Structure 1
Amino acid sequence: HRVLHLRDRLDLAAELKLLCERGPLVRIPLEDGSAVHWFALGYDVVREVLGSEKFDKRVIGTMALPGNLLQLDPPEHTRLRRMVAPAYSVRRMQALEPRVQAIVDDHLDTMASTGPPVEFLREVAGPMAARVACEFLGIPLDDRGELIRLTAAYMRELAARLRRDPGDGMLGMVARDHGADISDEELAGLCAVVMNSSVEQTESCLAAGTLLLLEHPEQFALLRERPELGEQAVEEIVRYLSVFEGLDPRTATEDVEIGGQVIKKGEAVFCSLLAANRADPALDGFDITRKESRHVAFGHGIHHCLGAPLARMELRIAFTTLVSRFPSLRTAVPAEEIRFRPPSSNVFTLLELPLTW
């Protein structure tokens, strides 16, 4: 379903806009007759689907990893998520905040030292996101360089080690509070999701979000003058970018009414976060002074991003510190020359971001 990933730079491509004109829920019978698919394109309908108990995340023919919450349905999903959820409480993010600020400052220190220009994605955003993830996980300091490199069995041995001798961070918390109830492979899988796909989403928000701010220089400056706008800005940035563009299909376990339409048992629904966040032209222009941003960039319901508290805090700290420390930041090429990754279900990202100051 490539149309769900068609963009014009950061905006929707005309072909996807035309699809969205077909209403918030679009029936897609497959030409070969093999299945009936549905596209959920509107904010309300996406929330209807994602909050419903009448869908599962089955594999459909139209890698399974231990500890990967996104591939579990209740009740195992509920069991595992309950064990790990406390690593993201407000108490946990509050304690982590100054250490994340310091890691952000470390990386802007490196940026300030190497001097301009920099390829911001590879040299700043990536390392920053990976280092914050290590700190959140409580990876032993001696292992962080190697873990980040390998990320680009080891994970299990790392989990086995840091477990039998608990430490700090999410991994230490889970092992200490639920040691017997979680295997080394499951703990490794929890780590892998944080270090791999989560860093991908976060790094892409950091780099493409920086571009977006630079493309709206009045708002770049506004965030420097009014850093209390940071939480609002992050909501508007994750909405506008929609770096996680489309979700894994939800298969109806019984006939179910969605958006006034009957989705039949066994039919698969594809939720477009991109369309839901961007296809309403009323409130689409980028504006960090919006006090409340309407979006589903982190999903909704039982699979709502477990990392959203960390992501929101890390992005707020990063964007606010960046605009403060580099008031003269600009793209080192015209924005129209920036390359974006071609249509894919992979994370939406730019390919490089040359910046100067």
Structure 2
Amino acid sequence: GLLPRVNGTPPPEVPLADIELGSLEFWGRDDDFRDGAFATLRREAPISFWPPIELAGLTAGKGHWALTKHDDIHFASRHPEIFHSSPNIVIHDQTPELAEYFGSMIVLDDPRHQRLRSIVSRAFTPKVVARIEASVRERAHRLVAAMIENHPDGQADLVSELAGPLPLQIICDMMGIPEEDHEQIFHWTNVILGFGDPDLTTDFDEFLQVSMAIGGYATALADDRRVNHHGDLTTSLVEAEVDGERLSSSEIAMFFILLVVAGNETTRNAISHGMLALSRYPDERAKWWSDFDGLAATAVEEIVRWASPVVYMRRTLSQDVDLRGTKMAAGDKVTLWYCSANRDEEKFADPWTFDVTRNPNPQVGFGGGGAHFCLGANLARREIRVVFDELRRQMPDVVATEEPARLLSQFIHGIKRLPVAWSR
């Protein structure tokens, strides 16, 4: 909240010769500089080739074509046969023998992708979903109420106390994980998530051990449900079937490992950026708090467009492609910069305005559409809606009180800490 900002302010004009998408220094600049770089790219070099970020001492891989236009990103997403998701969806995979272990369906192309996603989807039965919906409400209500008891001074970090724990507690609830086990699930998850942070010194040996441990935890959980039926997603996964194919315990473990990353830190960063935007632009909070259920759908969609928690996804070309007269070769990597498509001057009027009533809103924060479209998009929209509903009811004047501590990442639009304050 700290620095005053006027809703609708465009980014500074960033000279093309100043943009270094392969430098880590670039990803450390503030959001205005980044938004201004991509604005320059959309105008002057909308498809361009970049080397990967190189951490001195480690293999970096080959470079990538940056797609910065909403129409280009949509096209790529609609043609998975040309733009493959296998081998992986990050610029450079550091553990390629474990690509499928961590990635589950997101690193598969068809037909393997559709087969797996079909079986996983059918496990989300009406009963399992109704339990998830009660969990979202219960968990958000308890976490906000805990912030109030744990902080008589009326100050806390939104990330550690709410935005961090809510998405993971909800994943634990749908898997049927006991309360007692959360500590270990959280510690393992945090170590996995930390392995990308260059402000942390995370041991690769430790990363492997926690990765195997959470996977062994998950296969044992699924095996328990094979003998003991419960009303949880774990049991629905072991029982689900499509054309006679069922899921092994290892496949369920890999999907769980994907959830505690892809379904977790994404939602966390949508919540934190949503809090930050509602703090910077208080008229939007006032409007939202005045008609909460009636503006919730457009408000949530704008929080996702604004936050773009997933900054990009990578693809790999199976054949040559010429689009916008830019020739890209089979085998090249391509990156889909959702953070740029969600400011594309050709799709959104007033793109620099955070508008909780915005409509239409063809935002691509859940991806550009198609085969890999976020499996949890409606679950994420619900988590966002419900957490701000509980803040609105319990501490309506809560506001960010400091600029965020930002995660240094090319992939995740991360907030590490976000101080907030409220009154009673």
Interval containing the TM-score (normalised by the shorter chain): 0.7 to 0.9
- Counterpart of 2:406, as a letter, is F
- Fraction of identical pairs, as percent: 27
Which of 311, 318, 324 pairs up with 2:393? 324
Match of 2:341 in 1: 276
1:295-315 CA distance string (max 9 Å, x none): 110112111111112111111
Change (3 A) 1:161 1:92: closer
CA distance in 1, matches of 2:46, 2:127: 38
Which of 97, 100, 103 pairs up with 1:65? 100
Match of 2:122 in 1: 86
Give 1:75 deviation, angstroms. Answer: 0.9
* Structure 2 residue runs without a partner (length 5+): 1-20, 53-60, 191-215
- Counterpart of 1:159, as a letter, is A
Match of 1:99 in 2: 135
Please report the RMSD computed on the Cα atoms of aligned residues, expressed in angstroms. Answer: 2.8
**1:298 equivalenced with 2:366 (yes/no):** yes
Match of 2:74 in 1: 47
Give 1:142 deviation, angstroms. Answer: 4.3
**1:111 equivalenced with 2:147 (yes/no):** yes
- Counterpart of 1:157, as a letter, is A
Change (3 A) 1:7 1:311: farther
1:122-169 CA distance string (max 9 Å, x none): 111111111111123333444334323332322322232234423223
Give 1:173 deviation, angstroms. Answer: 1.0
* Structure 1 residue runs without a partner (length 5+): none
Q: Is the 8 A contact 1:163 1:171 kept in 2?
A: no
Match of 2:379 in 1: 310
Which of 211, 215, 224 pairs up with 2:280? 215
Match of 1:246 in 2: 312
CA distance in 1, matches of 2:304, 2:32: 12
1:73-120 CA distance string (max 9 Å, x none): 111111100001134578854553233112110111101212321111
Which of 120, 135, 151 pairs up with 2:158? 120
Q: TM-score, normalised by structure 2?
A: 0.74
Which of 15, 18, 24 pairs up with 2:46? 24
Q: Is the 8 A contact 1:140 1:162 kept in 2?
A: no
Q: Is the 8 A contact 1:255 1:265 kept in 2?
A: yes
SS at match of 1:303: coil
Which of 343, 348, 352 pairs up with 2:413? 348
Give 1:294 deviation, angstroms. Answer: 2.0
Which of 136, 140, 143 pairs up with 2:174? 136
- Counterpart of 2:66, as a letter, is F
Which of 113, 116, 120 pairs up with 1:77? 113
SS at match of 1:118: strand
Q: TM-score, normalised by structure 1?
A: 0.87
**Aligned positions, number:** 349
- Counterpart of 1:71, as a letter, is V
Q: Is the 8 A contact 2:176 2:234 kept in 1?
A: yes
Match of 2:188 in 1: 150
Change (3 A) 1:218 1:302: same
Q: Is the 8 A contact 2:275 2:399 kept in 1?
A: no
SS at match of 1:247: strand
